[PDB]
Amino acid sequence: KELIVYFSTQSNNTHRFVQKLDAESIRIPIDEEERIKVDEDYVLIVPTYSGGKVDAHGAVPKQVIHFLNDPDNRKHCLGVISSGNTNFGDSFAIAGPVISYKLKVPLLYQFELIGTKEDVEEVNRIISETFNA
Amino acid sequence: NYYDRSVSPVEYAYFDQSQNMRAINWNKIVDEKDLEVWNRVTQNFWLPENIPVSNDLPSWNELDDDWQQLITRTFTGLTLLDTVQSSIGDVAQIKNSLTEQEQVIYANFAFMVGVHARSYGTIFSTLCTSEQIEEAHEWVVDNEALQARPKALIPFYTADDPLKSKIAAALMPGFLLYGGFYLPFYLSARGKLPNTSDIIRLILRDKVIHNFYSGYKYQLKVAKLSPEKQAEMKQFVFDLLDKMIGLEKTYLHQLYDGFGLADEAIRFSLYNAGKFLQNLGYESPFTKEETRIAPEVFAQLSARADLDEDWDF
Ligand SMILES: Cc1cc2c(cc1C)N(C[C@H](O)[C@H](O)[C@H](O)COP(=O)(O)O)c1[nH]c(=O)[nH]c(=O)c1N2
Ligand SMILES: [Ca+2]
Ligand SMILES: [Cu+]
């Protein structure tokens, strides 16, 4: 029952990373009028959009907040993987820590853009161990 | 629909005088990603006067004439690349825009890269002598290895292939300055010029979005081309990046000669070369080993490397 729930904007960086992973994935819709219901355990994979302002506001995409706001969706989160770009410095991938704090779940990994070979191999291994232990 | 039977002024000016012009429509937006980027870069507006660089004087005065010269030369070199991108590169992108908002975003990019170039002037005004400033300018003009890099990109901006122009516009903020940006982070890892490093971090907060946006617009255009032409463009990107990596390595070995920073500076460069490729939708072929820099220096870039009322709980 290995499952990913992920968000990706129109740039589809997080989408492309997630499609390189072994586990089945479900996409949180971009459209703010649309919502999804998930009733299985999942690892959450989301990008950061605070924009390096000095400030965790907008760090978690609004669509991800809307998804987690539903307690039926919220309760199934085993852990969060966040992405972004180290050039945002103190704001790098901070969507993960924010979600980790809000849900009281582990921050499992942080990566950049569409991810490397190493990121794919590591996240596959981490998702496996997360659903076992 | 008025939009489908009219052109933007810049389309009219350079490409098609056969149709009447439409005003920009910020109320009906083709691509929400444009509004995303516009809001962030305008909200992130800054000027180098905002940073008290005078507080770097103590750590600056502890550096010998060789290290002070290295910094002035490095930053004058980066000033040149920002002057290229502000005066040619970003403004050249406006007429090749997919959307109306993209035209205005590239005008913001050209202005803010102008602010980047100006910020080095602010540092020099505080720390450097007139002799150090003049010497650095002479050195930049006469350094053929330095000059080779912008000389390789400018032709793509002035030529009539918009995709090659776009790749060049992405490569500048995505790669070409990071060999130089290594130096301030190396120094601030040793508690030297900490306020200068704050200016560099504000510059990177802009350049990361510039590289992303150019790479995003590149991908939207190439996606419409035939599989053959997509393979052709991918070939061109790797061929150009190979050339630019070669020119950058040659320059950095001359810049950092006798300081022993060339090797780490080149690894930081290749790390960013990897991110440039990813921002164009291509896999990075670089090994985590090829791109590794010292943790204490990387920590100066990001310490994380190691709220809205819509929250219902
Ligand atoms: C306007 C804006 C703002 C931000 C970003 C980008 C852009 C365009 N990104 C980088 C972003 O998370 C990264 O490019 C992701 O790979 C994008 O994922 P999707 O393409 O949306 O799946 C980013 N990254 C980060 O580490 N911290 C941040 O605060 C931000 N903020
Ligand atoms: Ca100013
Ligand atoms: Cu730029």
Side-chain angles (χ1 to χ4, degrees), chain B residues 76-85 87-89 140-141 143-158 168 171-172 175-177 240 243-244 247-248 251:
Chain B
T76 310
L78 296 184
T79 304
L80 176 58
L81 294 183
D82 287 339
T83 304
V84 169
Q85 196 62 18
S87 66
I88 311 157
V140 165
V141 165
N143 189 328
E144 290 298 340
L146 198 166
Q147 292 286 322
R149 286 136 75 254
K151 283 185 182 182
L153 292 183
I154 286 165
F156 298 117
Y157 295 144
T158 60
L171 191 144
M172 181 70 81
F175 167 70
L176 198 49
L177 282 85
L240 176 58
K243 180 181 183 182
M244 296 312 296
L247 294 177
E248 179 68 352
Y251 169 59

Side-chain angles (χ1 to χ4, degrees), chain B residues 11-65:
Chain B
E11 174 75 354
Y12 178 93
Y14 292 105
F15 295 114
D16 186 356
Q17 292 98 49
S18 78
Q19 313 188 51
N20 280 3
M21 280 168 280
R22 47 174 149 82
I24 184 153
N25 193 336
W26 281 94
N27 301 296
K28 196 69 70 204
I29 284 162
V30 165
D31 194 349
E32 277 290 303
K33 181 60 70 168
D34 293 333
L35 183 57
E36 219 164 296
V37 168
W38 169 262
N39 284 346
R40 185 39 46 204
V41 297
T42 58
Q43 284 166 21
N44 281 356
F45 172 87
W46 65 276
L47 298 172
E49 287 81 0
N50 296 352
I51 303 88
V53 175
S54 61
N55 291 340
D56 278 357
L57 276 165
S59 54
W60 168 266
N61 290 324
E62 289 165 358
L63 293 168
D64 62 32
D65 286 10

Side-chain angles (χ1 to χ4, degrees), chain A residues 9 11 16 20 49 51-52 56 62 68-69 74 85-87 89-90 92 97 110 112-115 118, chain B residues 33 36 40 44 178 205 208 212 219 271 275 278-279 281 283 288 301-302 304 307-308 310 312-313:
Chain A
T9 73
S11 42
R16 269 173 290 183
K20 287 187 283 183
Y49 276 97
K62 195 141 294 194
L68 291 178
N69 276 351
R74 199 193 308 162
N85 197 309
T86 53
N87 292 325
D90 282 3
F92 166 56
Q110 298 189 148
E112 289 183 291
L113 306 174
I114 64 168
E118 293 93 324
Chain B
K33 181 60 70 168
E36 219 164 296
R40 185 39 46 204
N44 281 356
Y178 278 100
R205 189 180 66 174
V208 64
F212 159 77
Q219 288 180 69
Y271 168 61
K275 289 162 68 164
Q278 289 180 248
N279 282 281
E283 304 297 345
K288 274 294 294 176
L301 174 69
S302 175
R304 284 305 318 165
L307 285 173
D308 191 48
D310 288 353
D312 276 16
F313 62 101

